[PDB]
Symmetry: D2
Subunit: 276 residues, 4 copies
């Protein structure tokens, strides 16, 4: 039986520490996409282990609402910021402020993505490139800004949130599959070039996770969903807290020797899911 | 190795190992077919009976190439100017091809852009441009050909990729990411399009002599010689060898191959320094 | 689009149209383990249709004597049948000596010998697992190693290992075969690196589900669900022996002069979509 | 960390000390190297252990040290992973002593440098028998004796050698690639019995027989280490942390995966 989760963008009402509560004490994590879904639960878990956060995505409203829930449930600081990962000046602006407020950033989680089901034949060039732009160029943009502004001189840890869609070429998902495959390759590249600056860089590829926009958009009809979930190895959907725990493992000193790796946390699902 | 020539010029002689009618009367649309690997793929194709359309941004480049290719092989070569990033231009090119030949049987996505640069010095726009050309560019040509012809008649796509992303090669985050995304795209399209009789595969070349790629990315000649003699086959590959493996994938001999990546790199990704 | 023709039994093709030049392997000699039945037999026939003489070697002397009569009957090239278990190195060494005595050289080794059956991992005995590792993995290494020491080390050569995609997603009922074939894939890379400097190319070909083979008969399952998964796979059909032999011939030939350490999958995209 | 097969003098917790409270882990190769440090770090989180390998004096010595440093129980047993009667006997003994086994760590292996043209048939086969057949045998025994009916968690310790076909290592590369494939097959078959199965692939780890054997001359090893992304060797405690992660409830949704914990070394290390 998995750790408890909540379907909405709300904090866990109770929690049991399996990592020590001081694992990230006084560190600061910058989380793109931290106002909703997996990125919000990542923020919440990090703050429950001593970490302050900065959460950044397009909607200033989404992150303000989130930052008050996070701060309230954990007593740590959460700086919300409006920032499109495709706009380098907005990215530079956000990182500058995070540093003005905190004086340091230790961890970057690239969680910002967009996705929707569309057959390749109906997918426009602009549609495909929009997904490449947010997922891949966005991840590069934020990483590259964090490197210049803080990590190159102080070291750091980056976790990229990816997917397994590209492994078997999942139908209706050429855009997301291609974009997140490029992010897994970028992880290797940055691990190589930035390791000498004491920067670790890894990916975490989640399976179908309950209580997320990604599952609502992409899961398909509930009866065919249940049937594929029941046929997957752990016979269930993952939850956001399980994903936040793997991300926390990778962003922490427990993972001090892990770099350039892709941890798949998907209950086995890519091995068995249908690709009709 | 089979012989090759360093320039974007035709082979002075060629020995057939495939039958000279392997692609008789087929039509191959080759992006980047005016130079480097793409020029040699066009030439080898035409020497197996195929007409070509070559397309890239520079009209002067494809015009001069097309005269060379027709002159050497006796088959037809249509040159077109088209940036793979511009759906109007790509649509216009595929129409022009269909108007000239009435069919396209094969698409070779060879157009790419690359250069050496540390990830920390690489600009936001430099990264995105490589993704736009290599990745979104490949998707754009593949989808325009699907809509205009391959959906209704079937077809074969060969994507020219790379091994850079396997080990995260230094100075290459842009190209390594873009070509890894092309390898996933290959699988996605193979699955979606297979039922329309379309095969889609990736061919990843190693370091190839006589190419802009190697000129830009090869590094100093002394350190290049050294990684080369320390790789499994002990030599650079040439363009003719790459054209043979592309021809294999594009031909009825690979009738059961789809969603695959064929690495043709003399074993180099296994031993090259990173 | 119409596949090249094939026949279901271990019999030669009635007609064949060349797509490779008929002198591609003019007067070369290929040693093919498992060349008496199934995929290995069709590989033998196709090679000999391109000028190559063959040695076909497996356990059952009756099987290879009958094959070799048929092969030589249909193509006008020579086929030496030998009885040899790949697990017994004195027998391999003697078979290879005998071939060198007959033909004076060997240019190509195709390692096609394998053992497979459906079995749940919880029912698979220790000896059953080991037996499949011993034939597929040790047996491949053994043959490759004898060929190296008897001829290829000094003369160069080309090796094609026939493998599978089962280990990619951990196909159920196939732990033995999937592990064994994943070892051979790794072995391909290892040997490509060590033996490249002796002018030896080593690649793997991984076939998908193939009509008119013992493999499909044993492992296909009932015809109705077999039909369903075939129809749901990207080319919507089973592969045939002739198509696999064409990919094997490609890799074994001078057209693949710069291909080594690679695994070419030739499965109609089956592993992307087949249920697990 | 500490070079020998000795316990750490001190240890600060990053996972809670009750993470594995009262669980039982059966660790093949638990008497030395990585296996010994895994047993120690598991015991520091509340776990009891069973350490099993061919040498009974090696595991007797290890067990007294592990118990002594941690106050948890460590049952040593002698068994060859290639002999299914012995594996069945050790597993029966662990069950008599403890009544349960929650976790299996398949750490036993044999390796040495040898060019492929010089490796004997028997030398190849031996490495395949220990790493591959051994790992299947222990997993399948544990499945039949306990995991099938009660669930459980397996961590296979593997390697990255097979990725680029590392020279001098055809045996070990092949064997470990087979065990990574087995990880996926068992994850799929046994997931519905509440069994998780993952691989952890370490890189070059200081204070181990692996590194003493396979590292080659010190000057050349220093060089490739400096040229690797984190510019240092891994230690045994870092590997035991990643193995603990996978073996714990923190990895409740991880199955069928390979975690590479090698400092990025396979990405840059020489080969040829
Ligand atoms: C499209 C998205 C990624 C980003 O939005 P955006 O930049 O505002 O993009 P727009 O809506 O302008 O759409 C851009 C292009 O994509 C196309 N597109 C967008 N959604 C699409 C869909 N569901 N199907 C097909 N085409 C689509 C648009 O039509 C437009 O293409 P065009 O110029 O040919 O018409 C949107 O899905 C989003 O913001 N998602 C965030 C939430 C999310 O995706 N969560 C799950 C992550 S797992
Ligand atoms: C850059 C290229 C890929 C694409 O051309 P383009 O679309 O006109 O792009 P631009 O010339 O506007 O350059 C795009 C960005 O990349 C950057 N860039 C180009 N060459 C660069 C180099 N060697 N190092 C770092 N950045 C570079 C530019 O400075 C610009 O960035 P900025 O906007 O931050 O100033 C060009 O190299 C090209 O056309 N190459 C084609 C042939 C080739 O590379 N063959 C090899 C394939 S192996
Ligand atoms: C078993 C095989 C792999 C090799 O034969 P062999 O070396 O004579 O081995 P045996 O007949 O002694 O069987 C060896 C072990 O595997 C077991 N075995 C054989 N077939 C089995 C099956 N279908 N299910 C479970 N176990 C099986 C035997 O019971 C024995 O184990 P045990 O000692 O615990 O009883 C046999 O299947 C074979 O000859 N295959 C060749 C043809 C083939 O497999 N073609 C398809 C490749 S796609
Ligand atoms: C060989 C080993 C794996 C297993 O020992 P064992 O089963 O008693 O094996 P043996 O000593 O009987 O050796 C079996 C074969 O391997 C060969 N072999 C052993 N060491 C070898 C070496 N360094 N180089 C080449 N061949 C070797 C033997 O000669 C024999 O082949 P043969 O019949 O052709 O003579 C041994 O190295 C070992 O016990 N290792 C465990 C510790 C270890 O390897 N740790 C490192 C990290 S895994
Ligand atoms: N959910 C799943 O089952 C699943 C499976 C595999 C992978 N994932 C991955 O997990 C991550 C989170 O997904 P989720 O399902 O939790 O959905 P989500 O809640 O919609 O998260 C996506 C986040 O990205 C932000 N975002 C989108 N575009 C952006 C941009 N251009 N700039 C900055 N921020 C942007 C969104 O906020 P704004 O709209 O405010 O920008 C949103 O908060 C993604 O990386 C996704 O690919 C999810
Ligand atoms: N050479 C190597 O060693 C090597 C190794 C691995 C992979 N490759 C791959 O092989 C292919 C050929 O490389 P090469 O070295 O032969 O280099 P090249 O000669 O420069 O080929 C690139 C071609 O792409 C065209 N092109 C670039 N951007 C374009 C755009 N936006 N739209 C349309 N056409 C475009 C260029 O023509 P215009 O300028 O007229 O547009 C040129 O003909 C590339 O895909 C490369 O990634 C090469
Ligand atoms: N058919 C498929 O769909 C498929 C799919 C994926 C992979 N493959 C691979 O394709 C190859 C051939 O399979 P197939 O389906 O055509 O089956 P097959 O006809 O049964 O071929 C297996 C052959 O191996 C020989 N063999 C078995 N054990 C041997 C040993 N110890 N020593 C020497 N030779 C031995 C057998 O001959 P004796 O009985 O005379 O020894 C038999 O000719 C195998 O490598 C298989 O793994 C097939
Ligand atoms: N060290 C590295 O840098 C490195 C790198 C990648 C992977 N690894 C992996 O990490 C694990 C431990 O390696 P290590 O360096 O720590 O070496 P190690 O100390 O030699 O550990 C190997 C263990 O395997 C046991 N063993 C060997 N054969 C056995 C058999 N037939 N049955 C039962 N037990 C057996 C040995 O004990 P007995 O002699 O008492 O049997 C020994 O305790 C191995 O799986 C290795 O492949 C290590």
């Amino acid at each position: 039986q998995p750790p408890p989760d909540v379907e909405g963008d709300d904090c866990l009402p109770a929690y049991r520490h399996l990592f020590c509560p001081d694992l990230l004490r006084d560190k600061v994590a910058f989380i793109t996409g931290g106002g909703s879904g997996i990125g919000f639960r990542i923020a919440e878990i990090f703050m429950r282990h001593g970490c302050h956060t900065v959460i950044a995505s397009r909607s200033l409203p989404r992150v303000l609402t989130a930052a008050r829930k996070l701060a309230g449930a954990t007593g740590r600081r959460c700086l919300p910021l409006s920032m499109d990962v495709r706009a380098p000046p907005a990215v530079m602006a956000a990182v500058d402020q995070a540093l003005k407020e905190f004086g340091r950033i230790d961890i970057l989680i690239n969680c910002a993505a967009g996705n929707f089901l569309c057959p390749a034949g109906a997918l426009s060039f602009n549609a495909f490139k929009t997904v490449m732009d947010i997922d891949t160029s966005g991840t590069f943009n934020v990483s590259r800004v964090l490197y210049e502004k803080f990590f190159r001189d102080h070291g750091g840890v980056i976790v990229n949130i990816t997917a397994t869609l590209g492994n078997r070429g999942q139908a209706l998902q050429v855009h997301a599959g291609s974009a997140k495959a490029a992010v897994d390759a970028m992880t290797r590249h940055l691990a190589v070039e930035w390791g000498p600056q004491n920067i670790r860089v890894n990916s975490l590829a989640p399976g179908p996770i309950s209580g997320t926009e990604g599952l609502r958009r992409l899961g398909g009809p509930q009866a065919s969903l249940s049937t594929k979930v029941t046929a997957s190895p752990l016979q269930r959907l993952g939850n956001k807290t399980e994903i936040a725990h793997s991300v926390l493992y990778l962003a922490s000193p427990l993972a001090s020797y892990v770099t350039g790796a892709v941890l798949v946390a998907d209950g086995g699902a890519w091995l068995t899911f249908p690709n009709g």
